[PDB]
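Task: complex structure prediction.
Instruction: return structure tokens for all chains below.
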Amino acid sequence: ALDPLSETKCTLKSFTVEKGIYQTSNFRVQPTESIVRFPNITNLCPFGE
Amino acid sequence: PVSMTKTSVDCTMYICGDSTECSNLLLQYGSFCTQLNRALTGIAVEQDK
Ligand SMILES: *[C@@H]1O[C@H](CO)[C@@H](O)[C@H](O)[C@H]1NC(C)=O
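Output:
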């Protein structure tokens, strides 16, 4: 996890990296906050009764 | 015809899209997904060739 070159070395399981372009990991935006949306609360049951 | 479309697919996001428990369960299967990605990347390099 030190640097991209180290990620490349770990993925190839090698200490020597021959010239080229290597796909090492996957970028992914993590979700920041959670959203919950439901219909308007209506017909509150008459526990008042 | 000369070339295909260079399509690559990520297992972890395909099989277990943004799921911790599913990703942990998928770890037990070994390098199935590393070799899937390897096959697809080989195909794409072949398309450029
Ligand atoms: C009964 O009425 C009072 C005052 O209006 C209210 O505070 C209370 O919550 C009511 N009881 C129920 C079960 O809603």
